[PDB]
Amino acid sequence: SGSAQLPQEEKAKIAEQVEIFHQEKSKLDAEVAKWDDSGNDIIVLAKQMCMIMMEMTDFTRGKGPLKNTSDVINAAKKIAEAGSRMDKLARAVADQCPDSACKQDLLAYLQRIALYCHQLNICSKVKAEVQNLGGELIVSGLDSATSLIQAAKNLMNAVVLTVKASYVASTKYQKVYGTAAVNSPVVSWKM
Amino acid sequence: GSAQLPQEEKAKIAEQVEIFHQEKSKLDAEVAKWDDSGNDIIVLAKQMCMIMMEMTDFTRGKGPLKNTSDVINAAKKIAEAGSRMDKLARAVADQCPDSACKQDLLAYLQRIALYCHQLNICSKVKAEVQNLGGELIVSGLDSATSLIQAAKNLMNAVVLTVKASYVASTKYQKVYGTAAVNSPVVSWKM
């Protein structure tokens, strides 16, 4: 077989990066716990994106339904689709919002999501090459999964702050126009 | 964030490089005999030899190729040359009045087309990561050896074709004399 395992240093580097990712997913479960799902697709989408980023982390330690690079490339494209639908929703929430400090906070978090979705797309290549460098034949791109996790941790972080900022933007819309406002709030926040 | 090949696989490369140097020496031999000029078959044979040296050296940490894309480009150059060589020996084959020889040269000319193709395919030297048996493993580390093998097979067919081209010109002259109305397409001077 022309196959070998990743070197222990990189395996440990992978593992320590997946715990960092689990802390941020903890935060996401905490935040979404509080809220009923019906009438809130921001919450549903955040859960979907977390579900997939879970397949992607599992991949890097040897578990989950992701088997080859094109699986990982596929996962990243789903996350980006779900993020794009989150952007549309949250954007609409920001347009109802009358408090500009919170309108602008929400819109800024949407930039982070677009950015980290992009970087997740790039990193999902987990590309590996043989290279003739420095007088030796070497394999490079062994950290390609370490960079994949750090993209997911960053995206996971931005999603949490985006859900929080969508809720704040919502309370300010109701604060100003009331729960009988002629136009209903874009998403509902119940328990 | 990089690593060197397993010794298990480094060893398997150096040994397939050895079989390659062997076949290269047969070519180096046969080419010292002759004189470049008026013989583009010889010239093309050496061009194919140098690029293949570039390709084997890559697998040993040496030479100019650094990327897969360099290896792929080398294999493209090699097939370009093999194509220019096929044109030349094809003409030499048409001249051959003997048919046991015309056939041989056309046969080796088809082994070249074959191995140029297999070299092209192998020059990708692709490496994957995948999730297999609860592990993160790198695959495709045996790519270098398939590349050398294809180089060696190509090398051999070049030696066969250079020799068979000499012999096919020899038989063109035994029959139509060193005063033949049409010169031999290739000239063989020591």
Side-chain angles (χ1 to χ4, degrees):
Chain A
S1 81
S3 305
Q5 292 185 36
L6 272 48
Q8 263 158 55
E9 297 88 284
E10 203 80 41
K11 269 180 156 198
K13 192 144 63 81
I14 288 188
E16 96 200 1
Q17 288 297 319
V18 72
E19 67 204 18
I20 276 66
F21 172 80
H22 271 117
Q23 317 187 5
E24 300 268 359
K25 166 214 164 298
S26 267
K27 283 152 128 174
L28 177 67
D29 291 300
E31 179 62 45
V32 292
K34 334 177 170 180
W35 310 108
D36 182 52
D37 284 9
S38 45
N40 197 339
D41 254 28
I42 287 191
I43 281 302
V44 180
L45 288 164
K47 273 167 173 157
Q48 291 179 2
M49 294 165 82
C50 187
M51 183 177 77
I52 302 161
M53 278 186 266
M54 225 60 233
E55 290 165 13
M56 280 171 95
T57 37
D58 284 348
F59 171 90
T60 60
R61 306 172 307 166
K63 195 62 219 103
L66 292 184
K67 294 299 161 172
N68 66 76
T69 279
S70 73
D71 294 339
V72 181
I73 296 178
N74 197 70
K77 263 143 182 264
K78 280 191 264 145
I79 301 182
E81 250 158 34
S84 152
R85 297 172 84 76
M86 202 194 275
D87 198 275
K88 188 151 153 187
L89 252 178
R91 212 152 274 282
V93 174
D95 299 324
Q96 271 190 327
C97 183
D99 195 296
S100 267
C102 304
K103 181 170 182 145
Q104 295 314 310
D105 209 33
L106 182 55
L107 287 172
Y109 281 124
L110 296 186
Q111 285 307 136
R112 288 282 127 190
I113 284 181
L115 170 59
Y116 289 131
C117 285
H118 184 56
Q119 302 195 342
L120 192 65
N121 281 325
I122 288 129
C123 293
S124 60
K125 304 330 203 332
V126 282
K127 225 64 212 174
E129 329 202 342
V130 288
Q131 270 193 299
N132 175 22
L133 295 194
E136 299 304 332
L137 189 65
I138 55 101
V139 201
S140 59
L142 296 197
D143 52 3
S144 73
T146 306
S147 313
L148 182 71
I149 308 306
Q150 166 136 61
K153 164 234 163 157
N154 284 331
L155 176 56
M156 188 62 63
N157 186 254
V159 164
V160 176
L161 300 177
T162 296
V163 172
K164 284 176 175 196
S166 306
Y167 170 63
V168 162
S170 185
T171 75
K172 307 219 160 304
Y173 171 79
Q174 291 205 314
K175 177 134 181 191
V176 173
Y177 298 101
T179 65
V182 85
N183 323 97
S184 211
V186 170
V187 298
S188 94
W189 303 86
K190 326 151 53 162
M191 334 279 299
Chain B
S2 302
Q4 202 159 176
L5 265 43
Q7 264 56 29
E8 207 138 55
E9 187 62 58
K10 285 211 253 181
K12 202 180 288 201
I13 284 171
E15 205 34 45
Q16 282 262 18
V17 152
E18 180 48 29
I19 308 180
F20 175 83
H21 201 321
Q22 286 175 11
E23 202 86 24
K24 183 221 190 248
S25 299
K26 305 201 217 173
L27 185 63
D28 273 338
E30 181 60 29
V31 85
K33 293 179 185 179
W34 309 103
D35 195 306
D36 281 322
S37 35
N39 188 338
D40 269 339
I41 286 179
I42 287 290
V43 158
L44 296 162
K46 303 206 236 209
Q47 207 177 334
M48 294 168 83
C49 192
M50 281 290 84
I51 297 136
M52 281 183 267
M53 269 309 302
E54 290 188 334
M55 288 175 107
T56 70
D57 281 357
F58 159 94
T59 70
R60 284 182 9 213
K62 314 270 152 309
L65 314 188
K66 306 153 64 210
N67 289 322
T68 280
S69 65
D70 287 322
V71 181
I72 291 176
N73 178 251
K76 177 196 151 127
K77 285 191 264 147
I78 271 162
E80 288 173 19
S83 211
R84 291 204 274 139
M85 186 190 269
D86 191 80
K87 195 213 208 187
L88 250 203
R90 212 149 270 282
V92 161
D94 214 78
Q95 226 176 25
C96 206
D98 167 18
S99 292
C101 261
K102 163 153 191 165
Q103 265 307 286
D104 279 328
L105 170 62
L106 282 153
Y108 312 120
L109 271 194
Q110 297 258 263
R111 317 187 28 149
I112 285 192
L114 180 69
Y115 292 133
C116 277
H117 179 92
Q118 320 208 349
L119 198 60
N120 280 327
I121 284 168
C122 291
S123 60
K124 269 46 150 160
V125 278
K126 316 134 113 166
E128 311 136 275
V129 201
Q130 46 188 18
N131 176 298
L132 227 47
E135 279 302 281
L136 213 53
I137 63 134
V138 199
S139 317
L141 297 215
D142 69 318
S143 277
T145 37
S146 311
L147 173 69
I148 307 167
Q149 294 188 14
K152 161 211 160 284
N153 279 26
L154 183 54
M155 184 69 75
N156 177 244
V158 156
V159 178
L160 258 48
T161 308
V162 165
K163 280 177 182 2
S165 272
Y166 171 62
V167 163
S169 192
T170 279
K171 278 202 121 281
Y172 175 73
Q173 295 217 299
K174 181 164 109 206
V175 167
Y176 298 98
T178 82
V181 76
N182 305 294
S183 318
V185 185
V186 183
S187 90
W188 298 86
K189 206 289 159 283
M190 309 177 286

